[PDB]
């Protein structure tokens, strides 16, 4: 009986594999030869932001592309103004071990999470003299890894209990629970249209989750080890996963199949954070080699390097207008990079 | 140079003032990661150490020894998979690893866990204070004469007490031999691979013992001293 279910699973797996191998007529390497090479894309440290005592684990920009939140293992969120290297808010935390942060699109809210297994939602625009803890979403079984706002009363979280969840802030309870991951979830990225979201976990697997149905949508394999970061292409028609096997990969959601594999013989250290520029043409990825690499998503060549950190690069995020690139690392520095003509 | 910029720089200055006042407290404390298993007396170590003190994924115990602050972190209510959150603990002063010496069944699991801790990247500079808990149970077990340790570790019939052993008064040689055999099992892993960048300090602790804070104090002192003496190219 149980072996019968094993055989049924094997049959479905084979059918999926064959159907996937059917609709793969052209590899993206062949159909991008006519594409002119990106060239060489160098960037320089326009600003360096200091004030964190310990490692920085998370970093998120805002909708205005000016303010950015950063979370450090000293129990501190700072809301920097990268234009002037000022500090607008410095919120201490209840738990000094934090691994994620967010920044609500309206600018009125930030979020944090970590080994305490709680998502703390902080209310900023209140105008009486202090920053209060608006809510403490609790109910996860393992550590949180990434949380991202849809709006001011809906949040999505990814936990080490092999699950993701959609919480209602004012209610406080979990509205939906997304289960189906064998290992613990590392990263989640919300669609540009806020309609689906992709998640990648330690089992070499990423998936789409339909927010308003609570069910999984597709699944993707190909990696050798833990997936550490994930991010949506400027539209919900692709997403790039960097894994702990020192490889990046590009996954579509129409073809339901790997698209490109970015790797080098030299690269042996893993990957921590990925992000896309506002063209789908610059995939930025931090590494444990104490450096960040630029990649191009249509040619699988480096076409860019970005060094300057003394320790592991642990964060990455481009702005909504494409103007800057923030990198936070374990040396407690936030480097805001921009190109030059 | 409006009034808005003036208010902004005033805010930045006040925030940096708070950051400095907090850095003074932060760098004047030592953070310790407490690891073990269910059968270990880890909860007893935490509870009986709540003396002179100044759901949930982390429990935090703050204790002061000789006007030095110590933070100890116990990871409760998280899954067994540990390869991901332990990376957060590379800046701690020490890892206090508690082991059930009087178990004889899960002790090889403890050795494998300790081997993984020792050889792990992001932990190649963090020293491990090794507590071999529940010593009275081991004493009575190898005194009564049941459950021979030879049957789980076959390198025991050819083991003589190291000459540098210091038995307590009123203790049989067999208790001493087992007690140091387990310590040797751990220390053999300790010195096999790790370079001089970190060391392992073993102690034969007991659940009811009232001295563990002082031991953590002394071995943290040794850790800092060894680090700084290697930076100076002494040692």
């Amino acid at each position, epitope marked *: 009986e149980l072996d019968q279910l094993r055989q049924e699973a094997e049959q479905l797996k084979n059918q999926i594999r064959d159907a996937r191998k059917a609709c793969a007529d052209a590899t993206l390497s062949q159909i991008t030869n006519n594409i002119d090479p990106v060239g060489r894309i160098q960037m320089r440290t326009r600003r360096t932001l200091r004030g964190h005592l310990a490692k920085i684990y998370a970093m998120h920009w805002g909708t205005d592309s000016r303010l950015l939140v950063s979370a450090s293992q000293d129990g501190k969120l700072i809301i920097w103004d990268s234009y002037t290297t000022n500090k607008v808010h410095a919120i201490p935390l209840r738990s000094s071990w934090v691994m994620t942060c967010a920044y609500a699109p309206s600018g009125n809210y930030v979020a944090c999470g970590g080994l305490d297994n709680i998502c703390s939602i902080y209310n900023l625009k209140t105008r009486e003299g202090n920053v209060r803890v608006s809510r403490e979403l609790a109910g996860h079984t393992g550590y949180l890894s990434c949380c991202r706002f849809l709006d001011d009363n809906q949040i999505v979280t990814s936990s080490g209990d092999t699950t993701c969840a959609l919480w209602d802030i004012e209610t406080g309870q979990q509205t939906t629970t997304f289960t189906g991951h064998t290992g613990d979830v590392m990263s989640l990225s919300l669609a540009p249209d806020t309609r689906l979201f992709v998640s990648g976990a330690c089992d070499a697997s990423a998936k789409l989750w339909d927010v308003r149905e609570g069910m999984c949508r597709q699944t993707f394999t190909g990696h050798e080890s833990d997936i550490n970061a994930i991010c949506f292409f400027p539209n919900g028609n692709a997403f790039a996963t960097g894994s702990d096997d020192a490889t990046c990969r590009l996954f579509d959601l129409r073809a339901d199949q790997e698209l490109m594999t970015y790797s080098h013989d030299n690269i042996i250290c*893993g990957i921590t954070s990925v992000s896309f520029s506002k063209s789908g043409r610059l995939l930025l990825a931090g590494y444990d080699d104490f450096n960040c690499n630029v990649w191009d998503a249509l040619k699988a060549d480096r076409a860019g390097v970005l060094a300057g950190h003394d320790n592991r690069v642990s964060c990455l995020g481009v702005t909504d207008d494409g103007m800057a690139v923030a990198t936070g690392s374990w040396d407690s520095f936030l480097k805001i990079w921009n190109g030059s003509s | 140079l409006s009034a808005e910029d003036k208010a902004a720089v005033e805010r930045s200055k006040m925030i940096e003032k708070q950051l400095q006042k907090d850095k003074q407290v932060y760098r004047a404390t030592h953070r310790l990661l407490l690891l073990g298993a269910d059968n270990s007396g880890k909860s007893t170590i935490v509870k009986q150490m709540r003396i002179y003190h100044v759901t949930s994924g982390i429990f935090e115990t703050k204790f002061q020894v000789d006007k030095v602050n110590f933070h100890m972190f116990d990871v409760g209510a998280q*899954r067994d998979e*540990r390869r991901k959150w332990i990376q957060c603990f590379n800046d701690v002063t020490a890892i206090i690893f508690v082991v059930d010496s009087s178990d004889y069944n899960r002790l090889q699991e403890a050795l494998n866990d300790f081997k*993984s801790i020792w050889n792990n990247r992001w932990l190649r500079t963090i020293s491990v204070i090794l507590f071999l808990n529940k010593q009275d149970l081991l004493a009575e077990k190898v005194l009564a004469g049941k459950s021979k340790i030879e049957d*789980y570790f*076959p390198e025991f019939a050819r083991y003589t007490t190291p000459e540098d052993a210091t038995p307590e008064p009123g203790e049989d040689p067999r208790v001493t031999r087992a007690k140091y055999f387990i310590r040797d099992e751990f220390l053999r892993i300790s010195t096999a691979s790790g370079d001089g960048r970190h060391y392992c300090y073993p102690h034969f602790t007991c659940s009811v013992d009232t001295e563990n804070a002082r031991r953590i104090f002394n071995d943290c002192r040794d850790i800092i001293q060894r680090m700084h003496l290697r930076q100076y190219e002494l040692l």
Partner: nanobody, 127 residues
Framework: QVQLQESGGGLVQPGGSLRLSCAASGFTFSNYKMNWVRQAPGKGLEWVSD????????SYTGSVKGRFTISRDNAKNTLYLQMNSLKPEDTAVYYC?????????????????????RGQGTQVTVS
């Protein structure tokens, strides 16, 4: 997908011989550390043997050093454990396990309750 399909197993009289083999597919076989993890009835998951990337380092446990032997070839993606002079305690389910990360000497969660990179298991019974 990280697939580790196992062979071998069955019922053998005490003092018997066997050769458990675990064929691997879906990852670079050469650059990983692998282990054997067995689960006896009414017991937790414990650790039997370990072999490294190039096979230079082989390690076992106390109750195995004299009977079982670990081996691996890289040209064929298989991991072998040769069993002989078995005991009633040896009767258990067996899983071939892969250490999480490549080019590392670190094997976390190899004996975990839930683990992604583990075999389905082969039963080895001894009277």
């Amino acid at each position: 997908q990280v697939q580790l399909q196992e062979s071998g197993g069955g019922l053998v009289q005490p003092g018997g011989s066997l050769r458990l083999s675990c064929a691997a597919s879906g990852f670079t076989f050469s650059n990983y550390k692998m282990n054997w993890v067995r689960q006896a009835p009414g017991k937790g998951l414990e650790w039997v043997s370990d072999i490294s990337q190039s096979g230079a380092s082989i390690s076992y446990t106390g109750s195995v050093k004299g009977r079982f032997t670990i081996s691996r070839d890289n040209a064929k993606n298989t991991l072998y454990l040769q069993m002989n002079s078995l005991k009633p305690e040896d009767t258990a389910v067996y899983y071939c396990a892969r250490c999480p990360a490549p080019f590392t000497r670190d094997c976390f969660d190899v004996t975990s309750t839930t683990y992604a990179y583990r075999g389905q298991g082969t039963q080895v019974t001894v009277s």
